[PDB]
Amino acid sequence: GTHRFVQKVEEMVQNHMTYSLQDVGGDANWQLVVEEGEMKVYRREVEENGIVLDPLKATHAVKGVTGHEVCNYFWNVDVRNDWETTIENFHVVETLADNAIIIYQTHKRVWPASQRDVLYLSVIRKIPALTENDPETWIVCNFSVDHDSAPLNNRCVRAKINVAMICQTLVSPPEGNQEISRDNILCKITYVANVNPGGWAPASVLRAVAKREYPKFLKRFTSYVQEKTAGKPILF
Numbered sequence: 001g002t003h004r005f006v007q008k009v010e011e012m013v014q015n016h017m018t019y020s021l022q023d024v025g026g027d028a029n030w031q032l033v034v035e036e037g038e039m040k041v042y043r044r045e046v047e048e049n050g051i052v053l054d055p056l057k058a059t060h061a062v063k064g065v066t067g068h069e070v071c072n073y074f075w076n077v078d079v080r081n082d083w084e085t086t087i088e089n090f091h092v093v094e095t096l097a098d099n100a101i102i103i104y105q106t107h108k109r110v111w112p113a114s115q116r117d118v119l120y121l122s123v124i125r126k127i128p129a130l131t132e133n134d135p136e137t138w139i140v141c142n143f144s145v146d147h148d149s150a151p152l153n154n155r156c157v158r159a160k161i162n163v164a165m166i167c168q169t170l171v172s173p174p175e176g177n178q179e180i181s182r183d184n185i186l187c188k189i190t191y192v193a194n195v196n197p198g199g200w201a202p203a204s205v206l207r208a209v210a211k212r213e214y215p216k217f218l219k220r221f222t223s224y225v226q227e228k229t230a231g232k233p234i235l236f
């Protein structure tokens with residue numbers, strides 16, 4: 001629409017559609033560090049000046065939910081505290097459009113160092129399929145920005161993020177007179193997180209925290225979407 005971040009939003013969605021959906025399984029610069037069920041979590045080891053930046057990428061397949069649903073739930077701030085366990089406080093700093101907000105939040109200490117806070121634009125978008133033979137893609141991008149009404153917090157260190165949750169609904173209609181049900185749909189999810197913790201910590205500790213907290217978030221967040229949509233009509 002007409003807001004000042006539409007160009008940046010476009011570039012991010014684009015970067016993510018081209019570079020983030022890419023296959024990471026046989027990629028030797030990624031290591032698969034967590035596997036649970038349909039979930040796989042990868043990281044690539046990266047540091048710049050002693051600071052761990054490790055790109056992370058998780059794939060998941062979740063039964064009975066659509067991509068539209070998973071992204072709605074991921075994006076929607078009124079349900080955040082139902083699933084998010086790492087947040088201390090947050091608030092919407094601005095509304096840019098009906099699908100784009102800027103959020104400030106403070107995180108619980110996940111290592112014994114200063115709390116980190118973050119200031120990011122969170123946008124939800126549908127990428128149209130090219131044919132009706134492919135899935136439409138829903139994506140939430142969360143990436144850092146600056147705002148007059150949210151400068152640096154004396155106590156907290158400022159993390160910078162570039163995150164995306166990308167989902168696609170696979171449908172598999174039954175052969176007979178039955179109506180399509182939640183049994184017939186599967187959500188493919190790619191979640192990517194590139195975080196700059198904003199200062200130093202021992203790499204072993206930050207890496208053990210990523211390994212612990214990302215899979216805990218995915219399991220709990222996806223399970224939550226499954227619970228909140230069970231029995232309801234399907235939103236594609």
Ligand SMILES: CCCCCCCCCCCCCCCC(=O)N[C@@H](CO)C[C@@H](O)c1ccccc1
Pocket residue numbers: 080084086087107110116118142159160161163193195197209210213214217
């Ligand atoms: C960014 C601050 C780093 C220090 C706090 C967290 C350190 C690793 C914990 C990772 C937390 C996993 C759950 C994240 C779920 C998650 O994606 N949460 C979003 C909504 O609260 C913001 C999000 O797009 C994000 C992603 C990564 C880090 C911060 C915020």
